[PDB]
Amino acid sequence: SLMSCISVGTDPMPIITFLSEWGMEPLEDYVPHQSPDATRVFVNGVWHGVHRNPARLMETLRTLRRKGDINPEVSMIRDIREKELKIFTDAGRVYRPL
């Protein structure tokens, strides 16, 4: 397509820290029932941890890309009906503008 471009590839680090400084329970010490509906957190296909109230996390990171602090390319979703958060800093994802 005309508008489409390829993802270049960003760094995972200043977003991994940018996240664990917001609610990232390290996958290390998870508590299966204590953290009941734990919306687990991924990155490049990796389980970095878990966070409580997701909606907040989201609206946060959104108007965080919308200023530039995080590369306006790299993308991430919250699968509501699955309580998951996939993060993609990858290189190879086709994308467009909206």
Partner 1 sequence: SFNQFVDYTLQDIICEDSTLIISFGKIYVTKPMVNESDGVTHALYPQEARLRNLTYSSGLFVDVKKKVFIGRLPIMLRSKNCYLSEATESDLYKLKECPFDMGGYFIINGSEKVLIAQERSAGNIVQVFKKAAPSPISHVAEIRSALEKGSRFISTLQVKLYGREGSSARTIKATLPYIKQDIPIVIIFRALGIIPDGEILEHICYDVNDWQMLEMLKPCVEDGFVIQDRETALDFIGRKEKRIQYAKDILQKEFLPHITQLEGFESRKAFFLGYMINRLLLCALDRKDQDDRDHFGKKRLDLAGPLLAQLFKTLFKKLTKDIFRYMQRTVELAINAKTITSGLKYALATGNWGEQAMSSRAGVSQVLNRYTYSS
- Residues in contact with partner 1 by the rule CB under 8 A: 6-9, 27-30, 32-33, 36-38, 40, 44-47, 90-94
Residue number, 21 or 29, with CB nearest to partner 1: 29
Residue number, 41 or 70, with CB nearest to partner 1: 41
Q: Which helix (H) or strand (E) holds 68?
A: none
Minimum CB separation of residue 69 from partner 1 in Å reads: 20
Residue number, 36 or 68, with CB nearest to partner 1: 36
Alpha helices in 1-98 (DSSP H): 13-20, 54-65
Minimum CB separation of residue 6 from partner 1 in Å reads: 5
Measured CA to CA, the distance from residue 35 to residue 65 in angstroms comes to 28
Enter the DSSP assignment of 15.
Answer: H
Distance from the first to the final alpha carbon of the chain: 14
